[PDB]
């Protein structure tokens, strides 16, 4: 990985780029014929929002997602990981990948509400004052439809609307 640094000495500014140690893919993949890191390791339809060891390999130090042309993922799996990372941040599973706070900012104390499987951003959700009738009920979304084809070990399929 590459890094950039700025050193100021004698009112003169210098900018440099230095290479750093870079991680290497583990050898002997199960499926060398796979096209992206997911099928090469037989992980398709077998990960969820809570599998952070997998999700951390595709995000930046501040919680942002990495490009698809870099990771090599398929558009189908890049969208799943992009949504599973959103739900991991909201559940508090990536506490060391927080946004960069500019100098002179102290986040205010806010109500700590524990949550998981959070599809939408909290602030952009309005309350359901009128549930509606039984045949036109306004449901509450839980999870993501992008993870609907995941391996279910139960007889009842994934319920995405409560």
């Amino acid at each position: 990985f590459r890094e950039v640094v700025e050193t100021q000495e004698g009112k003169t500014t210098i900018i440099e780029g230095r290479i750093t140690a870079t991680p290497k893919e583990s050898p002997n993949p199960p499926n060398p014929s796979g096209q992206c890191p997911i099928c090469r390791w037989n992980l398709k339809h077998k990960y969820n929002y809570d599998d952070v060891l997998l999700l951390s390999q595709f995000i930046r130090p501040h919680g942002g997602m990495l490009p698809r042309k870099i990771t090599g993922l398929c558009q189908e799996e890049h969208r799943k990981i992009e949504e599973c990372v959103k739900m991991a941040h909201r559940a508090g599973l990536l506490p060391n990948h927080r946004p960069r706070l500019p100098e002179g900012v102290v986040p205010k104390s806010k109500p700590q509400l524990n949550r998981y499987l959070t599809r939408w951003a909290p602030g952009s959700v309005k309350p359901i004052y009128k549930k509606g009738p039984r045949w036109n009920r306004v449901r509450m979304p839980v999870g993501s439809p992008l993870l609907r084809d995941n391996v279910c070990y139960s007889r009842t399929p994934w319920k995405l609307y409560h």
């Binding site: 002997n28 993949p29 199960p30 499926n31 390791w41 037989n42 992980l43 997998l54």
Partner: peptide, 8 residues
């Protein structure tokens, strides 16, 4: 040390 059907 990984078989064809190995899943992490």
């Amino acid at each position: 040390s990984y078989l064809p059907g190995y899943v992490p």
